[PDB]
Ligand binder design. Structure first.
Ligand SMILES: Nc1ncnc2c1ncn2[C@@H]1O[C@H](COP(=O)(O)OP(=O)(O)OP(=O)(O)O)[C@@H](O)[C@H]1O
Length: 241
C-alpha cells in the first residue's frame, strides 16, 4: 500500500543521485526496518513518503494514489514521524501529548503514556501530567523527553508511522516496552523503523538494507543472516563481539 517504482531522486539540479531506481512495496500493517551505512539514503527514502520532495524518476504511491497528484493536506494526515530528537513545547506534558488529538481526556493520555513507557516516570513527578516541560520549566532526560514524543505520536494514529532513529539513544528495556506494543501499534498500519542499532529491528516483518542509494539486501533477521558475505551480516558481525 506504499509503492515506490523506478524512483530516482536528487535534492537539487547539481546534487548527486541520492536514490537510484528504487522499487518497493510495503503493505498495510507491516513492520519494516531500514538499516545501512551513514549516508546510504535511509531518511531520504522516508522523506519521499511525506512529499517533502518530488522524484525526478518514477512514482511514489499510497494505496494507488500517486503522491504527485494527491491532496497536500490529506498527505500530512497519513504519515506520523518521530525523529531522533523532538521539540517539546514549553508547557505541560498533557498539553504536549494532546497536540495529536485536541480535546483528549486524561485517561487516554495515560493509556498512550503507558504504551510508550512514559507513565511510570511522569506519575512520580510532583505535578504529574501537568508538570511543564520545555526551555523554561523543569527539564527532563533525553530518553524521557523521547518517550513523551512517542506517546504523542501514538495518539495521532497515522496510517504510516516513521521512527527515524527514535529509540537509538534509549536503553534496551525502554526500547523493548515500546516495540512490544508496536505489534499492537501496527494493527492496521505501517511502521517504518530506520535504525543504526540492528537489534532494534530484530522483530521486523522485513528488513531493508541500503547502500549508496539502493536496496541491496532484504528478508528477515534470519534470512539476511544466512548469507555470510551480505552487508547485513557484516554489520551484525561488528559490535556483537
Ligand atoms: N537537504 C539535503 N540537501 C542535499 N543533500 C542531502 C540533504 N539531506 C541529505 N542529503 C544527502 O543525501 C544522502 C543520504 O541522506 P540520508 O539522511 O537519507 O542518509 P541516512 O542513510 O539517513 O544517513 P544517516 O544514517 O547518517 O542518518 C547523504 O549523502 C546526504 O549528504
Amino acid at each position: 500500500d506504499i509503492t515506490f517504482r523506478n524512483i530516482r531522486f536528487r535534492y537539487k539540479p547539481d546534487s548527486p543521485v541520492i536514490l537510484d531506481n528504487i522499487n518497493l512495496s510495503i503493505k498495510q500493517g507491516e513492520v519494516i526496518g531500514i538499516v545501512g551505512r551513514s549516508g546510504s539514503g535511509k531518511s531520504t527514502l522516508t522523506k519521499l513518503i511525506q512529499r517533502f520532495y518530488i522524484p525526478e524518476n518514477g512514482q511514489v504511491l499510497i494505496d494507488g494514489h500517486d503522491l504527485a497528484l494527491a491532496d497536500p493536506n490529506w498527505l500530512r494526515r497519513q504519515v506520523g514521524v518521530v525523529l531522533q530528537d523532538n521539540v517539546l513545547l514549553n508547557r505541560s506534558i498533557i498539553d504536549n501529548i494532546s497536540l495529536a488529538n485536541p480535546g483528549m481526556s486524561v485517561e487516554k493520555v495515560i493509556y498512550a503514556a503507558k504504551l510508550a513507557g512514559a507513565h511510570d516516570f511522569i506519575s512520580e513527578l510532583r505535578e504529574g501530567y501537568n508538570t511543564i516541560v520545555g526551555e523554561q520549566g523543569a527539564g527532563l532526560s533525553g530518553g524521557q523527553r523521547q518517550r513523551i514524543a512517542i506517546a504523542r505520536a501514538l495518539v495521532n494514529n497515522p496510517k504510516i508511522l516513521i521512527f527515524d532513529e527514535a529509540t537509538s539513544a534509549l536503553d534496551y528495556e525502554s526500547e523493548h516496552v515500546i516495540m512490544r506494543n508496536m505489534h499492537k501499534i501496527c494493527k492496521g498500519r505501517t511502521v517504518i523503523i530506520i535504525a543504526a542499532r540492528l537489534s532494534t529491528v530484530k522483530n521486523a516483518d522485513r528488513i531493508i538494507v541500503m547502500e549508496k542509494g539502493k536496496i541491496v539486501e532484504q528478508g528477515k533477521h534470519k534470512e539476511l543472516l544466512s548469507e555470510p558475505e551480505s552487508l547485513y551480516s557484516y554489520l551484525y558481525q561488528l559490535q556483537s563481539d
